[PDB]
Design a protein around this ligand. Sequence first.
Ligand SMILES: CCCCCCCCCCCCCCCCCC(=O)OC[C@H](COP(=O)(O)OCCN)OC(=O)CCCCCCCCCCCCCCCCC
Ligand SMILES: NC(=O)C1=CN([C@@H]2O[C@H](COP(=O)(O)OP(=O)(O)OC[C@H]3O[C@@H](n4cnc5c(N)ncnc54)[C@H](OP(=O)(O)O)[C@@H]3O)[C@@H](O)[C@H]2O)C=CC1
Ligand code: SF4
Ligand code: SF4
Ligand code: SF4
Ligand SMILES: [Zn+2]
Lengths: 205, 145, 178, 95, 125, 112, 99, 206, 43, 103, 114, 342
Amino acid sequence: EEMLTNNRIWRNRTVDIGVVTAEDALNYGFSGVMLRGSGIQWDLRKTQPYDVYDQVEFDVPIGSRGDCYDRYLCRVEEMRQSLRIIEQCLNKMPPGEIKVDDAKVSPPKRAEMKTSMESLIHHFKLYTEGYQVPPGATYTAIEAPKGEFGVYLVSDGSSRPYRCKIKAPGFAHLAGLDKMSKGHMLADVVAIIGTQDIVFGEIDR
Amino acid sequence: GSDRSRFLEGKRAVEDKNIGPLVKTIMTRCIQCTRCIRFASEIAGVDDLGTTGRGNDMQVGTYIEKMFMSELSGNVIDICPVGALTSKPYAFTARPWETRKTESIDVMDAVGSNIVVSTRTGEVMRILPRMHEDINEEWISDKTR
Amino acid sequence: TYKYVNKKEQESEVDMKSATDNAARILMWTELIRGLGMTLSYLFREPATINYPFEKGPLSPRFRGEHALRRYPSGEERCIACKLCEAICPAQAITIEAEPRADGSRRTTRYDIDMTKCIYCGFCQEACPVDAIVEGPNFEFSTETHEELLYNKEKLLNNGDKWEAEIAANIQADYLYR
Amino acid sequence: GVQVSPSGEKITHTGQVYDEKDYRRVRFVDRQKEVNENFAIDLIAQQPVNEVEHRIIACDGGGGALGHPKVYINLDKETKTGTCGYCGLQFKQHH
Amino acid sequence: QLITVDEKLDITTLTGVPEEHIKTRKVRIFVPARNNMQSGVNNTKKWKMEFDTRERWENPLMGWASTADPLSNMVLTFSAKEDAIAFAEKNGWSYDVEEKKVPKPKSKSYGANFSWNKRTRVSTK
Amino acid sequence: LKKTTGLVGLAVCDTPHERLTILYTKTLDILKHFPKHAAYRKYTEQITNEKLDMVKAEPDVKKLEALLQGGEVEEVILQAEKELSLARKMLKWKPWEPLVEEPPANQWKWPI
Amino acid sequence: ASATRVIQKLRNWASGQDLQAKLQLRYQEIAKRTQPPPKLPVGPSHKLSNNYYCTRDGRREVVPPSIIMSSQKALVEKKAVTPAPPMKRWELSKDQPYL
Amino acid sequence: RPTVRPRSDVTHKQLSAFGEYVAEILPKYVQQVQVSCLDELEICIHPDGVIPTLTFLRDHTNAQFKSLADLTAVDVPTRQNRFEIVYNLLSLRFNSRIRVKTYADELTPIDSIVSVHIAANWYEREVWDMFGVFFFNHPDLRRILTDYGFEGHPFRKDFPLTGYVELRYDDEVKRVVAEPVELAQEFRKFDLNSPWEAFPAYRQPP
Amino acid sequence: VKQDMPPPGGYGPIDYKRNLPRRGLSGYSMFAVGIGALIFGYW
Amino acid sequence: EMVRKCDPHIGLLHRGTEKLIEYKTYLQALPYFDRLDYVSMMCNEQAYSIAVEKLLNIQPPPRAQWIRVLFGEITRILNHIMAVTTHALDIGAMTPFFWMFEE
Amino acid sequence: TSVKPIFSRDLNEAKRRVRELYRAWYREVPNTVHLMQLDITVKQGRDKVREMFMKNAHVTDPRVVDLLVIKGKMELQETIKVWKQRTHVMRFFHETETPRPKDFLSKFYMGHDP
Amino acid sequence: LHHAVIPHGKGGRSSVSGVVATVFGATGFLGRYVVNHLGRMGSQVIIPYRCDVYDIMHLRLMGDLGQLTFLEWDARDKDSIRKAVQHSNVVINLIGREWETRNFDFEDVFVNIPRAIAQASKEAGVERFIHVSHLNASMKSSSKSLRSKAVGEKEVRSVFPEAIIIRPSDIFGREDRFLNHFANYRWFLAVPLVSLGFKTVKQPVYVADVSKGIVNATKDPDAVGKTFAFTGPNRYLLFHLVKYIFGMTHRTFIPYPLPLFVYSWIGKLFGLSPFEPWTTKDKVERIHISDVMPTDLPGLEDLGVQPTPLELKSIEVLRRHRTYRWLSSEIEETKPAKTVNY
Ligand SMILES: CCCCCCCCCCCCCCCCCC(=O)OC[C@H](COP(=O)(O)OCCN)OC(=O)CCCCCCCCCCCCCCCCC
Ligand SMILES: NC(=O)C1=CN([C@@H]2O[C@H](COP(=O)(O)OP(=O)(O)OC[C@H]3O[C@@H](n4cnc5c(N)ncnc54)[C@H](OP(=O)(O)O)[C@@H]3O)[C@@H](O)[C@H]2O)C=CC1
Ligand code: SF4
Ligand code: SF4
Ligand code: SF4
Ligand SMILES: [Zn+2]
């Protein structure tokens, strides 16, 4: 952060690049960091805390004038506010159990399936068939560091699923590579791609 | 059923039989449902596989060494829900999710009985029956399995 | 809670002392010098590299690598051909066709991993109710050919006849966690 | 008990030796045949019989969590020996 | 706006399936049978559309069963027979139906095992 | 009296309490051409007439934000002129029309 | 340790902060190897009584979705309605609001 | 109860109340608004009325759903209109999500919402590439994810798991060319599907 | 007897907050050492 | 050198891990989700391990939730290293890439 | 049967739409062989265009012909542009896989293929 | 036959054909196509190499995971031929360099390699010994190779009878020694070809036509001794055969005729090259012996192939030899050659 957040070059190479405005990010569906980098206060840990994030104090870095250096700072600084949370998640950890206490959804202990029967049966079914989720459908949107990592499960009574589907934050950001690359040339379009936190696995799926 | 055992005492084990080269008794796991004496007394007409004793010490099978070698002796396999007595040739060649099941017919007797031939990667592992009411009823002979 | 990262612009009628402070940042470009001294701070450090074949980096007892078929302390191949280790293997890598051993016992005639498959996920050593198939701490078993990664059963028992001094220590270190 | 076939190749746990008239013996040329010399058919036979006192008893593999789900055997037969399907350990009743 | 056409609704062409898997390919529509080991009859109640099997040659290297016809492990679950033939006629495939096999309802009394006159008088209780 | 919004490309557009009034008053007028029984006209009038009273009584912007949720007032003028643009679309279209054209053919019983 | 106390001052200066206390080359402070064996706690519900699965069967408390305005099955002054109360200006992150 | 994910009864009335709202405001092209035990909403519609309930949900004071998330296409080949095409949307303002699904045949297209949500420029293209559902009024429909000669719509359940062609290098023509599929293991479809309903009174009565 | 892996009391604080200590002969000493070095170069 | 119109043809890494989950149970598909974002692994597992839980109407224990959050925000640091620095290789500064891949 | 059409009406309007497409390939096969190095002359390049149009003539449904044109406009947009390769366009020819005998007698000197 | 030599498999690339084969010269030009036409259909192909492991990498593909197994050897020993042809049903002979090495001459390579193989192959018990002589090589030729390539054609028949002997014409293909020979005369002032090219009638043949011919010869019940001749159509004349090349390769073309008094001595100057020579005493003379009319022999068309004309597959082998400003030139263009029937 010393080496980069005060130069000219880094500050004359990222600034005013990718000035994707607020209401157009949402029309494009970024939802992760390419919108809070433009001032949209939004995060699924202060708004939709899914695991233990209710009782976890931290700050959501927001930046106005979102131009590949203002979201850089939102990206260098959520490395801090996550380093702040380690201070919490290390201190308070209750001495409890580690998997679901329900042997038809989470298999038993590897020694509990050598004294007892049922634990051996459920072990012989969990790791052959599964556990027969009910039919339904969900959308778990999770804030991975790219953003709203989504999963549209569609279940049936079987132990297999019926068409999962994955929301790649990056399948919407890479489509924003067309308007953000307007006015900007070959040597700073190369920087836009890195200011979308691109990974070509989540997308190409 | 439940998830956990509150059983911490000690089990029992039963003394295995030698019914024959088709039926492989492991009777530590029999649950005394009498779905094998009601077969050998009402469909085969044999009256051999009685229940000998009382309590947990009760234990299905002949009191003596006898060979349950009849036609329709391989159907105690299919009818015992437990795997106490199962098929000796198809002892350990496969495992049922591994299979692929194609519905075909018997030959070699003129009944034209219906069958589920189960395969494992381009080979044959069992020859099971289909339920069809006019033909046999639900079960097949020992030659065609 | 939200935090502004780039928001400080407020014209305080910058005094001439705060001008040179800015006009000597420029014309001596000194903010960069604070980067050159920053990289000068690291050549004088100890480079973290390690002479690999003489200094092979740190691992832990659960590091899952090359598979192996363990064995009871009195011979007796520890596999019993259950088939709940290919029914879970997601890469569809294992084929364990079996027979009665002619002792009356129950063992494999066939076992297989295609190590060009085998995602190295651990589902087979945690599913095995007998601790036969494990996933050893090898990670130097590269091969010049495709056929040497089709470990069947003889390359995979004797492999387990190799690392058993080194496996059991890690299994003994971890049968409380699993 | 690795004993060579009349062709020359070695025998495995299971008789699988490629016949003399087989074309798939090239693959061992300039190479060799990984075959385990320690047959479990015999090592388990090189193991005595625990002449225990009770009629119903337990087997493990040296550690309840370290192998062999705990199964129990009926040692009424004095002629044959009772064995666990997991190991091949034999037992007797002594009376 | 609306347009009339009485044709067979062929979708032979929008799917690849070059030529060998349209005409030289059978189809079977059926309720799968009951695994007679179990008394469980919920693996019935659908109308799977399994296909014929073809050559499965043993790999010369290894023993693996290998194939060339990919359209072999091809289950497709439906809920009615009227919905299955409408789907295979469409894609150019040739169906061969086998109708449902429900078992009879059967009068079963616990007391007929204990008859004076009749012949169902059981033994072993 | 707003220097720099948090947002980007959403200019100040000073003189609120006018445009927020020019628009809501203009929805009420581009309404009244719908049917009275159409529930879009029934509902959005319940919306605007609240917001129009939460501007026609409150002159201070910062507390007006705490009356019509939608803080950063300028983000509301973007919405007020957007609903306005939608009623026009809902006029040339006929959403209040009778129960659906071509209902579904056993299309949704999910477990297959 | 490989510092010899004349490069510490250089190394601490050219960067501009102390880094002999916050170095990234781990020596001994780390947790060692071969920790003592644990005894993991059995979770709840291992208590041998009042643990019928029928009471704690979350997987089976499901029930199919409540259909609203079905065109052929249900067919079910009035105020306006939002899908939820709206989100607002959260807070402003005391102890570091402008960095 | 310690292992069963409490139901949180409050946000099941909020959405069901907004469900009647979206239906009676808009009886056209809407049927069986539904809301699951999992507190999430579903509004199924007739495909001629897509844009009139995406502009509505983008441009409306009490239904601000201006950010698109996904556009799937589920295949169910036991019905005429096999392709269920599911939208799911998000309110920054209300912190509420919603589901707006439709139907379609192998040939009964659906007009595109690229004007409403530009995010669906590519979510629609993949649906074309994966399934084959055409989309009226769409800039540059074409493949994204499949090869430049891939005859087929792969996520159709009619499509085999390994396709019909696979590629390799032919030294005789010096190219990566296709000859039809020739496996070495034959993917073993296991029959992992039990009897025993597992969910009674949550089932199919004849 | 149980010890899964809990922590001990506290662990003390971490220092996540940024700290770039400003430093340098400020704005007059630079040009003074510069120009003074540059008149001497002329004399 | 100025860019008038770009046309990415993402798809050169498609494999089809929305169609293979269809043939693999919920545990036998978990490690596919590491592959999607191969930089932030646990944050995907943490997602797929909730959509499944929702359908099951189940909650994990607390100690799992905490550690599931602990690694969910170590992956947060595995990635913004992989984004701050990979965005600098393309621009030229190579060293903080190396400084952090010891970290 | 009172079905909804797309991009056309009864078939005779949906064949100019097919000829407008043949009106785009026949002028752009000599362009591709120049752009990207190909062995084909022009005539076994153009005859293949007719060969892949004289495969789907058995169709009699407008909606289907309205749809096959579109996929052709894809593969012409992908060929007038060089998004394809020598590999992809010389993939239509099936030069590698030996053409199996249609006749009965030789069809089971190898394989159980009915 | 046995149980695995059975061809139970469709097509190839994972199937079986019962064509477990040795192909000795599978490091050069023709054998890389032979292995391709065996491995593609599904066949074990034993490939003995005397050479760099790096030069046999391109043979690692065109092989379906076990059917490509390599081993080492040299001609000057025994027990390295009695390991390759052991587990075989087929044997193929493709050896022959173009010249004399310091250690292997024309007689050590065209006579003593097939003899030792075919005897060492008859003892094993294999059924087929496809051999490749060269057409125009009856005896009494003007060369020294073709005077020895018929000796091998007799010292094989006298050792392993019932052998197939293919006598192909002068072959062309990518990385050939025939079209890429005349193509590289452009490095000098011009082409010194004899008698202004005339008096040298040539019908060349494409590689795959030869290779598809071999691969089908190892499967027929026919060809249990039948000689062959893989010649191809369009019996060209050399002057027009070369003018076609240098119109295809658009550089230029002017002749510079010579007798054999000097044009066979220039080869003795370039024959003094420790590396792969550009010409030789005899590589000049094959070009000029090349004269034949087909008389009775079976040929391709009664073996499985419909041969390919040079008019069509000449881009692929001369598109490299061109300059920019001719790098795309559309064989629509370039004035096909004049073919002579005689
Ligand atoms: C007494 C009366 C008479 C006196 C008369 C004399 C009057 C005094 C004259 C004073 C002159 C001051 C010094 C003149 C040079 C200054 C040049 C300069 O101003 O560079 C500015 C430039 C930034 O320009 P800009 O586009 O505006 O970027 C800021 C945007 N926010 O900055 C840059 O972009 C340059 C960045 C390049 C960094 C490259 C790194 C260089 C590495 C340094 C090597 C260190 C060793 C030095 C060796 C020196 C050679 C011996
Ligand atoms: N290609 C042509 O121009 C024509 C060739 N032919 C005939 O076709 C056959 C194929 O020859 P071709 O393959 O074209 O020529 P190559 O130059 O390709 O030589 C083929 C192989 O012969 C091997 N070889 C040659 N001499 C020896 C030796 N003394 N010891 C061991 N290996 C040796 C070489 O191995 P290495 O690679 O290690 O040198 C080379 O791989 C020959 O009979 C040839 O006469 C006939 C007409 C035309
Ligand atoms: S049918 Fe099986 S379980 Fe029932 S009594 Fe007979 S042996 Fe025992
Ligand atoms: S689970 Fe273990 S014992 Fe069972 S077959 Fe697999 S490796 Fe063998
Ligand atoms: S580690 Fe995972 S992928 Fe590898 S063999 Fe075991 S179960 Fe299969
Ligand atoms: Zn045991």
